[PDB]
Amino acid sequence: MKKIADISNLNGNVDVKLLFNLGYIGIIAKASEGGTFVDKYYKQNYTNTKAQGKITGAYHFANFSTIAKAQQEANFFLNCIAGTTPDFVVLDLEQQCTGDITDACLAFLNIVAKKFKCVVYCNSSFIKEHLNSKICAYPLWIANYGVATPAFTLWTKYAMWQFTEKGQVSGISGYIDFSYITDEFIKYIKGEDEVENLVVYNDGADQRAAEYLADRLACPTINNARKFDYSNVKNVYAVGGNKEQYTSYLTTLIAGSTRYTTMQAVLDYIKNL
Amino acid sequence: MKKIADISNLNGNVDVKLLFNLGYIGIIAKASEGGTFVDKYYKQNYTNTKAQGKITGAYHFANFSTIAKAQQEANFFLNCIAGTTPDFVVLDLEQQCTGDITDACLAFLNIVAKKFKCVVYCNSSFIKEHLNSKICAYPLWIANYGVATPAFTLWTKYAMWQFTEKGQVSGISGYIDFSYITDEFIKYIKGEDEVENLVVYNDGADQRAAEYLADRLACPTINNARKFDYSNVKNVYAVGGNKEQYTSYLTTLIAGSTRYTTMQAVLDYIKNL
Amino acid sequence: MENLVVYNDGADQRAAEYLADRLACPTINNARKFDYSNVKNVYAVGGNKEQYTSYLTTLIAGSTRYTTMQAVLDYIKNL
Amino acid sequence: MENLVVYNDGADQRAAEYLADRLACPTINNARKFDYSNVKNVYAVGGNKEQYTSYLTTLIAGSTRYTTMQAVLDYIKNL
């Protein structure tokens, strides 16, 4: 799994190339805290990361319990990152609060998500004490230190997992946090859509044969009558019929002269896989 | 194709065994004409035919144009055949009338059909001049003399075809009419239900395999979850699964350990047919 | 057989299967050459009456695949 | 992929296919081990949310196969 670092004003002036030398694919930088705290290193952290072609993130350190306050913080975070275009942004939740703050969190996110892909960062216990599954509309950046594998509730999958808050590199002040970042999340923030396998069929008997192939490939099927954009599919399989019936993106055709030999061809293709 | 004879008072006292010797499987006898004409040989014609174990029919020679009149004739025909239980009965349509008498015919039939399986008898030209496709709710006994194969409109199939009105047997007065009678009609008037082939499957992949078998057998499929009476099906095929899942009437099971070998077994069975 | 449901290849088969579940009966593909003479009720789903056996008892059909399905659910409801 | 419809084996597949026709998209059998992370809208048809990928966007389902189908036609109508 790839890794990403996060930094803030506590780290001072950072040569981000030290981190890129260590293999980190980007930098998530603190932009703001609460309603008025401006991170005075954010701009240069974003700038030097984006300039070098690496992944950028911006995080806001929340201090809200109420909807109103969440909205003020959301507008303030956007004001702090204006003039920068991070790949994604992060609502960092660790504030002292009571009870379930999920609606306030959604109020923040509703504002920010119109401009940036948002992620929610928190630890396992914060989730249990203060959130409900409505939060799961956004991906999770789980902070879980000391564990071999992260454990959390509400979400079933993480986008990033912050595994230490005690990273250290000579020439960078303070501690740096490090995170694993999934290939699914990297695709998401890059706009990368590619579906691996799709099986196409026409109405009738060939649909039977197509489903067997799709079971083997563990993929979807699609009726050829459906107007669909196949430009992003890597392997487009068709079952039955002629090439001329199908998308210009077609790359495998399994077809016989009867419904029965088409089925036999599909079973033969499945065996040879 | 089997044959059946029809007779009336014009034939006098008939030794029906003369006709059974010639191969005729039954006798359709005239019971009545119009609103008041009683065929005085009907009772003995029905009696001697039924006594000998042969097929019986009773026909009424219509003389109606109106609904009211049709109802009077219907009640009169039932009164004439009371004390007899013919296998089926016949509305014989040859009367002089104008226009479309279909509704009057249905009025007759509505009454008689509550007691007996009814058939409509007429020639090609009567159909064109006086009927509409509503009549096709009842089977057709087509009178078409001199032709190698009958031709008619509205209906697509006949139950019986009267091919001559000039039959003659020494010892029977007058002419006798002869008809072909189809195996489908004979089944119908005997209450014989038997379906030849049915393929059963359970929800999922095995349904795909079942449809291929049913295409080959040219028959229906049925989902095994459906509570159904299989007692009348001659060959009950099942695809996938274990014998214990299916009706006690099951006689062929094609099944493998996976969805794919079940499909291969079905294709192998289809080839070996 | 008391009931049978006929469909043509394609979307109407979906609707025919819901009707057959409710009638607890078989379905048959219209392309199959079959003797319908000993079926009491022959239902067809989708399309037009001329595409089907002369033995057809009831045709349930709308002008799109969607209204055909609606008509089959409405038939089921009123049964 | 913008839209995908998931079904479990059986009657719900019928309903899922009408929805996929209207969305002009693929369907996938829930038994298939698949990566849903790059699908914008993941519709499920029939059953309960816990049977499906955590990536589920919308579940359309009633308490019988028939009301599941009705709910899918109603979703289609209001679209």
Residue numbers in the entry:
A (entry chain A), B (entry chain A): 1 to 273
C (entry chain B), D (entry chain B): 195 to 273
Please share text taken word for word from the publication where this structure appeared:
The CTP1L endolysin from ΦCTP1 targets Clostridium tyrobutyricum, a food-borne bacterium associated with food spoilage in the dairy industry. The CTP1L gene encodes an N-terminal glycosyl hydrolase domain followed by a C-terminal domain (CBD) that shares a common fold with the C-terminal domains of the CD27L endolysin that targets Clostridium difficile, a gut pathogen that can cause debilitating and life-threatening diarrhea and colitis, and CS74L, which targets Clostridium sporogenes. Endolysins pass into the peptidoglycan layer and degrade the cell wall, killing the bacterial host cell and releasing the bacteriophage progeny. The genetically encoded production of the truncated CBD plays an essential role in endolysin complex formation and the activity of these endolysins.
The EAD consists of a (β/α)5β3 barrel, where strand β6 is directly connected to strand β7, and strand β8 runs anti-parallel to the other β strands. The active site of the CTP1L catalytic domain contains a phosphate ion, surrounded by the catalytic residues Asp-92, Glu-94, Tyr-121, and Asp-177. The truncated CBD is closely associated with the CBD of the intact endolysin, in an arrangement that is similar to the CBDs reported earlier for the crystal structure of the CTP1L mutant V195P. The two CBDs are arranged side-by-side, and the buried surface area covered by the truncated CBD is 2560 Å2. In contrast, there is an extensive hydrogen-bonding network between the truncated CBD and the CBD of the full-length endolysin. The close association of the head-on and side-by-side dimers creates a heterotetramer assembly that buries a surface area of 8410 Å2, suggesting that the heterotetramer is the predominant oligomeric state of CTP1L present in solution. An anomalous dispersion map revealed the presence of a sulfur site situated between Val-195 of the full-length endolysin and the N-terminal Val-195 of the truncated CBD.
